[PDB]
Amino acid sequence: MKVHKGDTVLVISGKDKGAKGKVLVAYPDRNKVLVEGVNRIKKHTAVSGGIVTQEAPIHVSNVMVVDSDGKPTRVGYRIDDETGKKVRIAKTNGKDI
RNA sequence: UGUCAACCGAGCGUUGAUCCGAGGAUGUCCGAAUGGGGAAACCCGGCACGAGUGAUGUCGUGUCACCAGGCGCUGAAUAUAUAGGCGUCUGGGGGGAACGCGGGGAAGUGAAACAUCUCAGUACCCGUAGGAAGAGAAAACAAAAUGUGAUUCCGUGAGUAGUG
RNA sequence: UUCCGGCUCUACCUGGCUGGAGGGCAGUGAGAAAAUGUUGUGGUUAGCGGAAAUGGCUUGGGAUGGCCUGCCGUAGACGGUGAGAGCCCGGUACGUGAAAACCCGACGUCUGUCUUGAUGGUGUUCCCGAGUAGCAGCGGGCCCGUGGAAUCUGCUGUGAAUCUGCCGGGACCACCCGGUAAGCCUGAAUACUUCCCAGUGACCGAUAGCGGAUUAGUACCGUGAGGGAAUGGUGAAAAGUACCCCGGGAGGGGAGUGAAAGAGUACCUGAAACCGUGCGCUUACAAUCCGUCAGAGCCCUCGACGUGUCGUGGGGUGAUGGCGUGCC
RNA sequence: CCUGCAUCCGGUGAAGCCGCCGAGUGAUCGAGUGGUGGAGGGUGUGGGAGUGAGAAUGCAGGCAUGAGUAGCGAUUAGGCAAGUGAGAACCUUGCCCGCCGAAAGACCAAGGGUUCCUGGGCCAGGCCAGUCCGCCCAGGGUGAGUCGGGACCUAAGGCGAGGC
Numbered sequence: 001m002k003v004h005k006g007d008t009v010l011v012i013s014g015k016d017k018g019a020k021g022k023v024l025v026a027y028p029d030r031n032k033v034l035v036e037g038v039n040r041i042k043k044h045t046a047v048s049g050g051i052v053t054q055e056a057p058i059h060v061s062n063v064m065v066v067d068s069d070g071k072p073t074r075v076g077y078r079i080d081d082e083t084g085k086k087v088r089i090a091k092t093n094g095k096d097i
Numbered sequence: 098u099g100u101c102a103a104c105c106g107a108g109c110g111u112u113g114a115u116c117c118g119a120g121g122a123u124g125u126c127c128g129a130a131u132g133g134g135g136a137a138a139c140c141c142g143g144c145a146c147g148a149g150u151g152a153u154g155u156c157g158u159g160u161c162a163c164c165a166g167g168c169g170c171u172g173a174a175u176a177u178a179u180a181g182g183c184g185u186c187u188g189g190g191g192g193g194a195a196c197g198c199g200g201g202g203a204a205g206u207g208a209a210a211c212a213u214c215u216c217a218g219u220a221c222c223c224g225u226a227g228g229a230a231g232a233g234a235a236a237a238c239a240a241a242a243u244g245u246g247a248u249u250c251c252g253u254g255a256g257u258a259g260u261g
Numbered sequence: 262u263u264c265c266g267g268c269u270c271u272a273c274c275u276g277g278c279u280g281g282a283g284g285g286c287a288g289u290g291a292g293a294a295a296a297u298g299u300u301g302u303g304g305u306u307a308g309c310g311g312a313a314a315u316g317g318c319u320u321g322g323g324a325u326g327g328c329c330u331g332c333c334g335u336a337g338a339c340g341g342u343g344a345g346a347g348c349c350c351g352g353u354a355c356g357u358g359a360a361a362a363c364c365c366g367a368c369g370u371c372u373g374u375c376u377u378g379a380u381g382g383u384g385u386u387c388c389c390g391a392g393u394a395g396c397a398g399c400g401g402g403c404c405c406g407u408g409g410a411a412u413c414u415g416c417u418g419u420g421a422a423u424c425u426g427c428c429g430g431g432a433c434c435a436c437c438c439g440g441u442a443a444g445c446c447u448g449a450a451u452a453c454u455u456c457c458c459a460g461u462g463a464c465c466g467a468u469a470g471c472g473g474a475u476u477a478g479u480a481c482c483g484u485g486a487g488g489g490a491a492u493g494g495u496g497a498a499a500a501g502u503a504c505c506c507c508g509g510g511a512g513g514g515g516a517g518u519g520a521a522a523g524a525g526u527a528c529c530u531g532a533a534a535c536c537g538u539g540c541g542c543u544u545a546c547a548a549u550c551c552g553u554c555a556g557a558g559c560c561c562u563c564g565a566c567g568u569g570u571c572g573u574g575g576g577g578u579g580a581u582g583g584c585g586u587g588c589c
Numbered sequence: 590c591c592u593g594c595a596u597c598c599g600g601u602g603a604a605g606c607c608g609c610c611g612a613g614u615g616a617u618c619g620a621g622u623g624g625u626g627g628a629g630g631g632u633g634u635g636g637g638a639g640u641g642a643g644a645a646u647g648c649a650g651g652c653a654u655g656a657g658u659a660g661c662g663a664u665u666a667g668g669c670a671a672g673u674g675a676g677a678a679c680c681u682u683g684c685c686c687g688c689c690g691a692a693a694g695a696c697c698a699a700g701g702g703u704u705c706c707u708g709g710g711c712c713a714g715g716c717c718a719g720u721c722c723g724c725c726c727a728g729g730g731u732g733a734g735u736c737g738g739g740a741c742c743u744a745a746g747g748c749g750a751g752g753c
């Protein structure tokens with residue numbers, strides 16, 4: 001999907017637009033991902049009762065990977081003549097990701 | 098780590114999971130059912146080779162219909178010979194929405210009734226194969242033109258020549 | 262328009278029969294059939310690459326809304342993404358691309374007739390598809406519904422000829438004209454979709470649409486053939502209301518979630534029959550297909566004028582008089 | 590209502606619904622205004638309609654009166670003390686009374702399949718309330734050389750290799 005676990009991502013649209021974050025888990029079936037620090041929601045937990053803060057899934061279409069230089073970039077692909085492994089490339093820079 | 102539909106506990110994966118493409122094995126029982134039996138999915142055996150017990154009782158893998166056509170042997174009352182009887186190979190028993198071929202084959206209804214007719218060779222049934230089928234190489238038309246030249250399928254030829 | 266051999270009883274010359282070797286002929290073929298040795302980016306069964314705005318200002322819960330600036334276009338088809346997206350995502354134009362297998366086409370051992378044979382003439386003796394053709398009786402379908410009844414055909418009797426032979430031109434005779442049945446194969450033009458792949462709708466949107474948007478030919482009914490049902494929309498995510506209180510629960514009130522809780526799993530929008538609570542007017546001496554035309558009082562209201570009184574004023578109620586025989 | 594064409598409106602609130610105020614000679618109209626809602630609509634000119642309800646003893650769904658009226662499904666009949674629990678004439682214990690007793694009792698085959706026991710509760714059901722249940726939940730429960738059948742034999746009848 002051009003997005004993996006452990007990458008750095010930025011939000012384009014939504015309540016928390018303009019905030020950077022780090023991805024935790026991915027859901028390819030529903031095309032949704034979970035990012036900490038964005039879309040924080042209050043949940044009622046009762047067993048002892050209280051209110052806690054958690055994170056809800058965000059659709060990937062509203063987020064995209066950031067460049068190592070701190071700028072938003074798309075994802076490109078290249079073919080290596082050495083091993084043939086497919087690599088991710090920053091379109092606006094050409095550097096590998 | 099499919100799904101109805103959350104939830105728990107358990108785990109794998111960079112040494113390539115999951116997925117999809119092609120081929121390959123296993124495939125309980127019934128179901129043309131074909132070792133024998135029978136109220137579908139339940140009862141009972143023969144033979145050969147293996148496994149187990151001091152021996153029976155037990156268990157695994159094979160094989161054990163019928164019909165027709167070839168091939169070989171045999172030849173009754175009865176003599177020639179046949180029928181019949183044995184051994185061995187080759188084929189068939191059912192299913193499928195529509196499409197074809199050859200037969201059988203109905204009644205409602207119109208005629209303001211109704212026997213002839215029409216409904217109709219329709220519905221249905223029977224025996225049949227295929228991916229298509231059937232038909233097919235003039236004992237054919239026409240009429241004085243020195244004409245066409247296997248078969249099949251469409252449009253006209255006309256709702257006319259006829260028939261009731 | 263090749264060579265040799267053995268045969269036409271036999272050995273020798275003449276004329277014929279049959280085998281072994283060039284050179285053509287075709288071959289998966291209806292004209293004969295079986296197998297065995299080397300090519301197409303031919304397509305198909307998956308995939309992969311694939312261009313351009315985090316633009317500014319505004320309403321906003323959310324921009325994919327409005328105004329102004331850019332860029333790509335062999336890609337402004339189509340869907341998803343928190344409200345109508347060419348430049349966010351899935352992909353579309355275009356390019357590529359397969360281990361194995363499929364089928365088609367082309368390139369290669371092998372099979373077999375003929376060259377013992379072909380070409381143009383002549384008079385004589387034999388052949389050209391048997392219970393068939395035709396004839397007579399009884400039935401079919403051709404427009405022909407036995408009528409004069411041609412042709413084809415089913416059954417029963419009788420029953421013919423081989424080239425100056427035979428059958429056909431709607432009876433039939435004569436003359437002309439066409440043809441050679443009584444044996445067998447033959448692709449192309451045509452008919453259809455239980456299945457699979459790709460596409461379309463001035464076709465339907467939950468009493469419509471296939472009987473079937475959900476437990477579907479299920480439940481259910483019938484011992485049988487068989488008949489045959491109704492049941493979608495919370496919201497962006499469940500964040501499905503912690504906690505406190507009344508209470509057995511059911512159920513409810515605060516406080517929070519959220520845009521809304523006039524969204525609380527009985528959850529979009531919520532009409533009419535139907536049942537209500539509060540408010541205003543009226544009725545207990547009355548003979549009404551239940552309305553209309555007049556019509557005092559009371560109440561609500563809009564203006565100008567003041568305590569309430571008029572006005573090219575509106576509304577609800579109606580005490581009381583006249584009129585008055587539902588719809589198809 | 591759906592459509593070709595040219596236009597305008599719309600999260601600063603589009604579609605229905607409920608009012609007020611008005612308007613046309615009709616089937617009606619309002620780009621005039623108020624509440625509810627949240628996602629597509631109007632005008633102009635052409636083309637196509639499953640295009641207009643009150644009645645067929647019509648059909649699908651919902652709801653009126655009779656009505657808080659009749660009944661609450663026999664020929665025996667209950668009463669008392671105590672207990673459980675929020676609730677008891679209908680549940681548990683104890684004591685009186687009555688009834689059946691060729692059955693209103695104890696069993697077989699046919700007939701149903703979990704109604705049997707233990708433990709849980711009482712929004713569905715029991716013609717009323719239910720602590721109870723032939724309500725449901727979860728678990729457990731069915732022991733044959735000698736009992737009934739098969740491996741033993743046969744009838745009225747069915748199948749039927751050959752065959753007619």
Ligand SMILES: [Mg+2]
Pocket residue numbers: none
């Ligand atoms: Mg497979």
Ligand SMILES: [Mg+2]
Pocket residue numbers: 123
């Ligand atoms: Mg096996």
Ligand SMILES: [Mg+2]
Pocket residue numbers: 130131
């Ligand atoms: Mg069998």
Ligand SMILES: [Mg+2]
Pocket residue numbers: none
């Ligand atoms: Mg059998």
Ligand SMILES: [Mg+2]
Pocket residue numbers: 166167
């Ligand atoms: Mg045979």
Ligand SMILES: [Mg+2]
Pocket residue numbers: 177178
């Ligand atoms: Mg003999």
Ligand SMILES: [Mg+2]
Pocket residue numbers: none
């Ligand atoms: Mg068959």
Ligand SMILES: [Mg+2]
Pocket residue numbers: 209210
């Ligand atoms: Mg008549």
Ligand SMILES: [Mg+2]
Pocket residue numbers: 210
């Ligand atoms: Mg008549």
Ligand SMILES: [Mg+2]
Pocket residue numbers: 217
């Ligand atoms: Mg006819």
Ligand SMILES: [Mg+2]
Pocket residue numbers: 227
């Ligand atoms: Mg075939």
Ligand SMILES: [Mg+2]
Pocket residue numbers: 232233248
């Ligand atoms: Mg033919």
Ligand SMILES: [Mg+2]
Pocket residue numbers: none
């Ligand atoms: Mg023929």
Ligand SMILES: [Mg+2]
Pocket residue numbers: 254255
């Ligand atoms: Mg004609």
Ligand SMILES: [Mg+2]
Pocket residue numbers: 320321
């Ligand atoms: Mg805004």
Ligand SMILES: [Mg+2]
Pocket residue numbers: none
């Ligand atoms: Mg925009």
